[PDB]
Amino acid sequence: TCPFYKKIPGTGFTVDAFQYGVVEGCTAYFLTHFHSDHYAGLSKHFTFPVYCSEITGNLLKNKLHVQEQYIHPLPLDTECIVNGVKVVLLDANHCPGAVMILFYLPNGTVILHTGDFRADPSMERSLLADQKVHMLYLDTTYCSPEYTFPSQQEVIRFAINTAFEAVTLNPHALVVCGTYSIGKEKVFLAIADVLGSKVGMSQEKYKTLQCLNIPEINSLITTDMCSSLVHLLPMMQINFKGLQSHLKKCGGKYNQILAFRPTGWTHSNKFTRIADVIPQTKGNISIYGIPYSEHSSYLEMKRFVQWLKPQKIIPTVNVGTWKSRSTMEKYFREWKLEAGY
């Protein structure tokens, strides 16, 4: 049945709740972003109103064939009325089209639902600064102090410098990048930009990217693999056997692969600086795991919550075990005592 942390009190609304069938009493289904653990259940046969960003609505129509008459895209940073209730969509700094949702309840309660987000100080200057938030539905993916990672900018600098040096040393090396969903586009686009290449990919993945309003995308991506020296493959194929096989398909154009796997976190982070990252190598194939995150680190999350000062926090991630839930509640109390709210 639908969990309570997916339901907005005082309304008929749910958030990211498409896999429960007809949720009783639900008049509007919101979708924060196009990731499968959130959209699971949507299809051309869905006949209730879906509220989302423009980019998410393009993906619903083109990838899932949801019918246009049930897609209700909203502009960002704009007060809108849904079934009698004021709402605002804010940029979540997650994947393309991902939003946080502000709900202004008729009784005066204000609720923020972060969806999935990577907290940033730029959020402290959005419409959130203009009123108090009483209840926070919080993406707690990395809510423990061991989760540190570098800025996205530092990670992309490392990837660009590594790829440029490799291909300049060996003009017959191929660069491969893994993907399994939208997000993390800067990884492969930045590497293709420094090399003077388009990114080559499957027709299905090209279609997905063309839904994203990214400026000058026709100039950076292609379905012609022969003309590209940066290739995008499914994340599952980013291993030595999968890469050896890909190299066979390129017909002797290339004699070396440099591959990137942009994981979230991996325990090399508690010790290793970004400068100190090394690949796994076998023969003429090297694989780099780089810590490119589209979720808050522990400290980013803590800063956001201590700025916002909510009266009540409702975690939405890691809620399935008692030790995880109790641990998170202990951090929330610490943050509140330190900051004085």
Which residues in this chain contact Ni ion in the complex, by CB under 5 A?
35, 116
Q: Residues preceding discontinuities in the chain at C–N > 2.5 Å?
A: none
Residue ranges in the chain assigned as alpha helix (H): 36-39, 54-63, 152-169, 185-195, 203-210, 240-249, 298-308, 322-339
CB of 37 to Ni ion, least distance (A): 7
Q: Which is nearer to Ni ion, 123 or 287 (CB)?
A: 123
Residue 217 DSSP class: G
CB of 247 to Ni ion, least distance (A): 32
- Identify which of 91, 81, 134 has the alpha carbon closest to the alpha carbon of residue 116: 91
Distances (CA, A) of 139 to 71, 136, 153, 231: 25, 9, 22, 32
- Yes or no: say if 180 and 234 are a contact pair by the CB < 8 Å rule: yes
Q: Which is nearer to Ni ion, 73 or 264 (CB)?
A: 264
CB of 197 to Ni ion, least distance (A): 28
CB of 32 to Ni ion, least distance (A): 8
Residues constituting the chain: 341
Residue 239 DSSP class: S
3-state secondary structure of 308: helix
3-state secondary structure of 321: coil
Answer positive or negative: Cα dihedral of 272, 276, 280, 285. positive
Q: Which is nearer to Ni ion, 116 or 185 (CB)?
A: 116
First to last CA, the chain: 35
Q: Which is nearer to Ni ion, 14 or 114 (CB)?
A: 114
Query: What is the rounded CA–CA span in Å between residue 334 and residue 327?
Result: 11
State both tokens at 71. 């897609």
State both tokens at 26. 């639900």
CB of 38 to Ni ion, least distance (A): 6
Q: Which is nearer to Ni ion, 56 or 269 (CB)?
A: 56
Q: Which is nearer to Ni ion, 31 or 308 (CB)?
A: 31
The distance of Cα 136 from the centroid of its chain, to the nearest Å, equals: 19
Q: Which is nearer to Ni ion, 116 or 300 (CB)?
A: 116
Q: Which is nearer to Ni ion, 105 or 317 (CB)?
A: 317
